[PDB]
């Protein structure tokens, strides 16, 4: 049946909550029908989309509007919500119905007179009828029933009002707020909407995220409203929390320019990080004398380490395990060593213990990650005991990333002399508690510590991120070797020194950046933001306004 189009004007407002408020002006953000939205009229069973919620209105009676269907592509594979208006009551059921929308025989049976379902048992709700009639022509002539159907989070909500209107083949003028009719806590997915005519017409609109200013009277009811997104005047009324605006100029908002597109630039690095050489080294140093390896001028895939089996722990400090893949770094170090396995928590950046204090200490900030895995095999050989543990340093709290293998005598204070017993000679401890394939602390957890320098210096390690071209002379969202921001990129014409990568202004903020592939210098100019004010003669004079940017 054919469509037609009209305008909502004022319709679609409802009480957003269950709170009594009187003689107040309350600003609320919810799904509402825009005051002047384009409403589609349908002749009176088409299937319409269901978005955030649906506005429905009609003057037809229950012998024409027998209910509604809400759900996803209707089949036995998905639950649908069936709302039927009977002569004496309303019946609402949720189930994997293929049909169940008949109960009215005439001529159309091709897609009807079928009752195939599954284990319904879902919110089989029965109550008073949603559609009430009037005393014929003794009313206002054609009662306009307004409904709002929402599906938000664990709820399907219905708001409505009967409010009889004067006869018209269009939507009426004037203000009326809808009240909650029923609230059904149904976990249903709704993407489509269909009316039940079992075959004059009806109106359908759609709700959008809007902020409305609602005016309540002394009796706690809504008598008016303002749509904040309608025009500059409504915006002014809303910012001033008033339905009346005095002559003058008001500051209501802030102008912004969107970049619409992004730019990603990296140096052409075709090398890959030697991670196999670290994690699959097969030869790991003791914590006493840990092995320090450096990584540079290559691409670092960390996802392959994080999203990987056989690791026991993967703890990142100062960075997320799922973000480091998109960051650029300089001088990445991989400290490779073996510990007893109950010392894993003792190599954290801020913890104490014989390892933290004597064998291997990290900085207090330490941006990086500690990665370790079982690897009980090979290392914990039966009869094999190969893990030097540094215990005696005379002092304590050695130093971040310092390796002390001096093997001096820990004079116990017993005497300022050389010797063995009472002298605690031999700084490392030879009683290695390997406990081959048994107990706890039997030397699981080969450890690799990744230390990163998050410097302004040219990246030496980049993630597997693909670059784009440049746009220039437009507001863009850019990323230059991890340096991000929004602005307009233009030729700087600045004489950068051969070693400089970017420039800064008097405020010490980024002013210009060198492109990693072309080595050209681009200025970064912030996009316009300004501010927005509205000029009005006053609402007691006219509703015409001027806008200043």
């Amino acid at each position: 049946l054919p469509p037609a189009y009209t305008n909502s004007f004022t319709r679609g407002v409802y009480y957003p909550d269950k709170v009594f408020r009187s003689s107040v002006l309350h600003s609320t953000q919810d799904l509402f029908l825009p005051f002047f939205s384009n409403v589609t009229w349908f002749h009176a069973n088409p299937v319409l989309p269901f978005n955030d919620g649906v506005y429905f209105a009609s003057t037809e009676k229950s012998n024409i509007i027998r209910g509604w269907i809400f759900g996803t592509t209707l089949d036995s594979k998905t639950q649908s919500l069936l709302i039927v208006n009977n002569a004496t009551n309303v019946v609402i059921k949720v189930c994997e119905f293929q049909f169940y929308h008949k109960n009215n025989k005439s001529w159309m049976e091709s897609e009807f007179r079928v009752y195939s379902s599954a284990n319904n048992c879902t919110f089989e709700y029965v109550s008073q009828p949603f559609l009430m009639d009037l005393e014929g022509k003794q009313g206002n002539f054609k009662n306009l029933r307004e409904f709002v159907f929402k599906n938000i989070d664990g709820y399907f909500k219905i708001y409505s009002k009967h409010t009889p209107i004067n006869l018209v083949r269009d939507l009426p003028q004037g203000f009326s707020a809808l009240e909650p009719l029923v609230d059904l806590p149904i976990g249903i997915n709704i993407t489509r909407f269909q009316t039940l005519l079992a075959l004059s017409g009806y109106y359908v609109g759609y709700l959008q995220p809007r902020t409305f200013l609602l005016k309540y009277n002394e009796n706690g009811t809504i008598t008016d409203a303002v749509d904040c997104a309608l025009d500059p005047l409504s915006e002014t009324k809303c910012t001033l929390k008033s339905f009346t605006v005095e002559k003058g100029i008001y500051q209501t908002s802030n102008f912004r320019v969107q970049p619409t597109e992004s730019i990603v630039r990296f140096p052409n690095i075709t090398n890959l990080c030697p991670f196999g050489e670290v994690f699959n080294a097969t030869r790991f140093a003791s914590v006493y004398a840990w092995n320090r390896k450096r990584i540079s001028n290559c691409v670092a895939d960390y996802s392959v380490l994080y999203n990987s089996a056989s690791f026991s722990t993967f703890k990142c400090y100062g960075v997320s395990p799922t973000k480091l893949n998109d960051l650029c770094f300089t001088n990445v170090y991989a400290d490779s060593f073996v510990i007893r396995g109950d010392e894993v928590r003792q190599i954290a950046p801020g913890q104490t213990g014989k390892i933290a204090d004597y064998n291997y200490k990290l900085p207090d900030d330490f941006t990086g990650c500690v990665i370790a895995w079982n690897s009980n095999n090979l290392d914990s050989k039966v009869g094999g005991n190969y893990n030097y543990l540094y215990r005696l340093f005379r002092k304590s709290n050695l130093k971040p990333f310092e390796r002390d293998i001096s093997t001096e005598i820990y004079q116990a204070g017993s005497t300022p002399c050389n010797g063995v017993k009472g002298f605690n000679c031999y700084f490392p401890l030879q009683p290695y508690g390997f406990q081959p394939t048994n107990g706890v602390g039997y030397q699981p957890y080969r450890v690799v510590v990744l230390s990163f320098e998050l410097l302004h210096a040219p990246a030496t390690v980049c993630g597997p991120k693909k670059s784009t071209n440049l746009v220039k002379n437009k507001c863009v969202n850019f990323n230059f070797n991890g340096l991000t921001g929004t602005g307009v990129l233009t030729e700087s014409n600045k004489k950068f020194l051969p070693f400089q990568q970017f420039g800064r202004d008097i405020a010490d903020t980024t002013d210009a950046v060198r492109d990693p592939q072309t080595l050209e210098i681009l200025d970064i100019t912030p996009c316009s933001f300004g501010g927005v004010s509205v000029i009005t003669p006053g609402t007691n004079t006219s509703n015409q306004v001027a806008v200043l940017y």
């Binding site: 100062g318 941006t367 405020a507």
Partner: protein, 50 residues
């Protein structure tokens, strides 16, 4: 002074909001961001008062 305060880093890992957000996940960034918000709000309130 008002501008320079933007680079103060009021106990956060970085004075740059983008560097915090690009590095930390939601539940971690919120903490670092809140530190900057408090410091910047206090700095702005000081400016206005003066």
């Amino acid at each position: 002074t008002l501008v320079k305060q933007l680079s103060s880093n009021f106990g956060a890992i970085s004075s740059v909001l983008n560097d915090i957000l690009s590095r930390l996940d939601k539940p971690e960034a919120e903490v670092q961001i809140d530190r900057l918000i408090t410091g910047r709000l206090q700095s702005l309130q000081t400016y206005v008062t003066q």
